[PDB]
Amino acid sequence: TSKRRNNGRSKKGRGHTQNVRCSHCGRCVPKDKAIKRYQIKNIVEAAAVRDISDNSALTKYKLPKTYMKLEYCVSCGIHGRVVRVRSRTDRRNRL
């Protein structure tokens, strides 16, 4: 029956939550049920950082980063290896 005590959600004291769109499928998933991951990366890959820094017109300009929050449905979180299927006794670990 109940594979999870919380039913796979994060909703406890309410009846409805708004929807969000899967970043890969475009599916509609509720805000709590969606798999939310955060990403902070530089706009230049590790190979090209040296090339840009060589020929630059600015004194010591610091390369900016990009920040975006990605939300995945369950199907596209498992398939994209964002999350894995865990053991029956290891499902309970929340760290």
Residue numbers at the binding site for RNA (CB under 7 A): 1-2, 5-7, 10-18, 20, 31-32, 36, 69, 88, 92, 94
Closest C-alpha among 37, 31, 35 to residue 14? 31
Shortest Å distance, C-beta 39 to RNA: 11
Shortest Å distance, C-beta 7 to RNA: 5
Q: Which residues bind another protein (CB under 8 A)?
A: 58-62, 64-68
**Phi first, then psi: what are they for 78, rounded to 5°?**
-70, -45
Measure the CA–CA gap between 15 and 65, rounded to whole angstroms: 38
Measure the CA–CA gap between 91 and 44, rounded to whole angstroms: 37
Shortest Å distance, C-beta 39 to another protein: 11
